[PDB]
């Protein structure tokens, strides 16, 4: 069977949105697409800087983007030329001026986006998927996570027939709406095709 997106079903209950602007239907679509462009940028130029979340907020006529990252030193750089070389182009893309803030994620092993990125980065380095999956799970569980489960799918190890292989540990009550569920997805582009990775991390209720 098909599942509901576990972040979408918890929006407004325990999980907040990644954009917190208001707009009438006049400027809603263009706000949305310029947000898409900024997000595509701050995805693809901070590739190896371990960014997990990009929160866009639009006061009256200008933007501020908060970048959650595990490795703040590279997105803050050498005295800070780099958030300048980023906001000078984000104000370029969104047409309004811009401000940039940088938040640190202190345990990068308890975030589904970073764990997914880690596993796909290893899968593109030609590493056995079993080792990636089990190391992710044990590293996440030894740091206080109440549960985790990872799932990889599609031509594992160059097989001709694709397979789905998942590893669970702890407690992941996806049907509980109180549950603090951190979920994310990534894709690894190898020489045999795409391999999909999904990661669920449960940290507690309410």
């Amino acid at each position: 069977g098909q599942k509901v997106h576990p972040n979408g079903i918890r929006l407004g209950i325990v999980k907040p949105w990644n954009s917190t602007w208001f707009a009438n239907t006049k400027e809603f679509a263009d706000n949305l697409d310029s947000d898409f462009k900024v997000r595509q940028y701050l995805t693809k130029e901070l590739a190896k800087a371990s960014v997990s979340r990009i929160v866009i907020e639009r006061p009256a006529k200008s933007i501020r983007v908060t970048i959650h990252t595990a490795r703040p030193g590279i997105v803050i750089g050498k005295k800070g030329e780099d958030v300048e070389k980023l906001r000078k182009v984000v104000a370029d893309i969104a047409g309004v001026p811009a401000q940039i803030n940088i938040a640190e994620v202190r345990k990068p092993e308890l975030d589904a986006k970073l764990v997914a990125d880690s596993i796909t980065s290893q899968l593109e380095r030609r590493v056995m998927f079993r080792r990636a999956m089990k190391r992710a799970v044990q590293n996440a569980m030894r740091l206080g996570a109440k549960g985790i489960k990872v799932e990889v799918s599609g031509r594992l190890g160059g097989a001709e027939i694709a397979r789905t292989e998942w590893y669970r540990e702890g407690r992941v009550p996806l049907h509980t709406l109180r549950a603090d569920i951190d979920y994310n997805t990534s894709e690894a582009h190898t020489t045999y095709g795409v391999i999909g990775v999904k990661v669920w991390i449960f940290k507690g209720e309410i």
Binding site: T20, R58, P59
Partner: protein, 99 residues
């Protein structure tokens, strides 16, 4: 005169505190504050197909609620207008003022 303030937001807690921030900063300059009144919320609904191809009965239904608050000020001293035009609230609230 009367000054009229309309607040629109996508969630009700942010707009609730924003209306607070307004109505006590209006009493801070010693002004009479009429309201705040909750006007009816406007909820726009959307219904989308969820398969990429040929699956007409499988659908998702979403909605956006817009919450509307109204407050009138009826005894403005000169230090009430500036005292309302200097105020800092987070990005979710859209304010419209009417002279």
């Amino acid at each position: 005169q009367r000054i009229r303030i309309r607040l629109k937001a996508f969630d009700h807690r942010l707009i609730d505190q924003a209306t607070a921030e307004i109505v006590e900063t209006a009493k801070r300059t010693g002004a009479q504050v009429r309201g705040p009144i909750p006007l009816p919320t406007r909820k726009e609904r959307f219904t989308v197909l969820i398969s990429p191809h040929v699956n007409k009965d499988a659908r998702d239904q979403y909605e956006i609620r817009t919450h509307l608050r109204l407050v009138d000020i009826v005894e403005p001293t000169e230090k009430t207008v500036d005292a309302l035009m200097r105020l800092d609230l987070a990005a979710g609230v859209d304010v419209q003022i009417s002279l």
